[PDB]
Symmetry: C2
Subunit: 124 residues, 2 copies
């Protein structure tokens, strides 16, 4: 929404989920773990930075059954959820203010691409 | 050095380089690309967070020849440097205030492990 600042960190998201997020249709991003990161987060899909969203909270842990009660929030197929979770807990990263950039930006390809480990959940 | 705050991001570094860094012997970390990240950075080796260092600057680009003039800063073997760089430019991430934690901390294993893409060099 016409911002001057850009996110410092990005998250790799596969289609169609990446698009659903930046197009503002998906406010819950499903992951196997929590994160304490808060604020803007770039959405990287197919090696291109297509947009961003603000990560404002994390809900969970959820069982697949509990997530199906929020189908409109994640738009994830039950078949894929179960095959993904593997009978284990899932979390939902809450997003808002998501938008798609006018032009997708290029992200450094592997292996030069710098990746950082999220240490926000480390037991200090 | 008795800090209360901990780094939010970590970098995966292979031994013996990881140890050389946290033990304060290696102030230059060699990488294929630059980064604008500044401040504390956890050093992750073998799936364990062993310590941290402050990333305070980035030098480069360097040719292998130019780096050999700073052997004491990176402690990297010429043979490995050339085999790594592959006839391409390299950069040196400048580190300081590095120390090894009293006890190495566990980092979430794959594939649950959350990794973020460094977008600091993206051409906006």
């Amino acid at each position: 929404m016409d911002y001057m600042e850009r996110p410092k960190l990005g998250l790799i998201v596969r289609e169609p989920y990446a698009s659903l997020i930046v197009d503002g249709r998906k406010v819950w991003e499903i992951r196997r773990r929590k994160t304490r990161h808060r604020g803007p987060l770039g959405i990287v899909s197919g090696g291109r930075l297509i947009g961003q969203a603000d990560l404002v909270g994390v809900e969970g842990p959820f069982s697949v059954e509990e997530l199906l009660a929020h189908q409109e929030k994640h738009l994830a197929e039950e078949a894929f959820l179960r095959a993904y979770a593997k009978d284990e807990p899932l979390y939902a990263w809450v997003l808002e203010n998501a938008f798609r950039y006018e032009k997708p930006l290029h992200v450094p390809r592997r292996p030069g691409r710098v990746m950082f480990v999220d240490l926000s959940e480390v037991r200090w």
